[PDB]
Amino acid sequence: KIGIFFSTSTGNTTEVADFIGKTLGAKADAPIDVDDVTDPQALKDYDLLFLGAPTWNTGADTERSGTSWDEFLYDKLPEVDMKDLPVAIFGLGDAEGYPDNFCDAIEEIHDCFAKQGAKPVGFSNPDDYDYEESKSVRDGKFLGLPLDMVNDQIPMEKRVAGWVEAVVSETGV
Ligand SMILES: Cc1cc2nc3c(=O)[nH]c(=O)nc-3n(C[C@H](O)[C@H](O)[C@H](O)COP(=O)(O)O)c2cc1C
Numbered sequence: 001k002i003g004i005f006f007s008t009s010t011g012n013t014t015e016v017a018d019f020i021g022k023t024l025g026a027k028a029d030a031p032i033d034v035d036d037v038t039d040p041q042a043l044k045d046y047d048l049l050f051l052g053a054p055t056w057n058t059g060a061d062t063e064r065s066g067t068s069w070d071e072f073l074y075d076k077l078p079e080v081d082m083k084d085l086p087v088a089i090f091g092l093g094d095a096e097g098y099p100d101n102f103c104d105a106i107e108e109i110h111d112c113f114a115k116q117g118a119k120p121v122g123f124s125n126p127d128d129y130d131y132e133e134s135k136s137v138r139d140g141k142f143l144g145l146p147l148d149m150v151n152d153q154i155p156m157e158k159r160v161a162g163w164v165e166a167v168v169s170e171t172g173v
Contacts, residue, residue, distance in 0.1 A: 002173060003046035004031040006053065007067030012092050012149045013052050019157065020050050020090070023164045027173075035068035040076040048121075048173045049085065050164075051113070051144075054092040055105040064105040073112045080116055087113050088122035088167045089144030090160070095131040096151050102129065103146035106136035110143040120144075122167040129153060 002024055006017040017031035029046075043049065056066025063070035089110055093103035110120050123141040126134075129148060136143050145163045147156060 001046050002028040002048045002050065003043065004028055004050045004052075005034055005037070005043070006031055006051065007034045007065060007069045007072075008054060009056055009066055010054075013054050013067075015149070016090060016092065016147060016156065016160065017050075017052050019160055020052075020164055023161050033068065034072045037072070037076075040072070040080050043077075043080050044082065044085065046085070048167070048171050049087045049118075050090065050167075051087055051109055052090040052092070053105045053109055055098070055101065055103050058098060058101050058104075060104075062108065064108050069105075069109065073108065077112055077116060082113065083117035085118050086121045086171045086173075087118045088163075088171075089113075089120065090147060090163070091136065091144055092147050092149055094150040095129045095146075095148050095153065099132040102131035102134040102136070103142075103144075104135045106134075106142070106144040106146065107138070110136070121170050122163060124163065128159075 053065040091103040091106040124145045126137045126142045
């Protein structure tokens with residue numbers, strides 16, 4: 001079973017989370033907003049997790065999403081043993097408004113989950129979007145899939161569907 005966990009402030013992330021669900025069909029559970037998670041142990045009942053979050057707190061070291069993820073990452077996640085579970089991160093941002101901080105929240109989610117033993121998958125080509133810098137680019141790769149739903153430089157559906165496919169291939173789920 002594949003799980004989809006996200007959070008949002010203005011609902012853009014929700015749209016993306018729903019779309020992933022549609023591409024996966026019966027293989028995925030309906031997306032769950034992190035704010036709705038009582039038991040963080042639920043995260044472990046899946047074979048693969050798609051995690052999504054926007055970036056709202058520009059330049060912040062921690063709590064970059066400005067969503068329920070900010071509390072969840074530090075108060076709840078530390079209690080979950082995620083050894084070997086693959087997680088694929090998608091993040092929403094604005095390459096035009098924040099050229100130097102493009103989808104910075106991806107790195108935070110990546111690092112927090114990695115610390116729990118999770119295995120990040122679904123890296124993407126940092127060249128897809130035009131931006132100057134991001135904390136989410138490491139070793140020549142984006143640590144997840146960045147999306148710009150503000151400027152729509154790249155049609156969302158085709159980009160996400162291709163990424164989902166790559167993730168399913170990589171993980172064998
Ligand atoms: C106040 C504000 C700050 C933002 N900061 C960033 C940022 O630092 N980096 C980025 O890539 N996008 C930034 N954005 C863009 C948001 O991530 C984007 O609008 C996103 O689609 C919102 O996702 P949501 O509707 O799920 O909350 C910011 C937007 C606003 C309004």
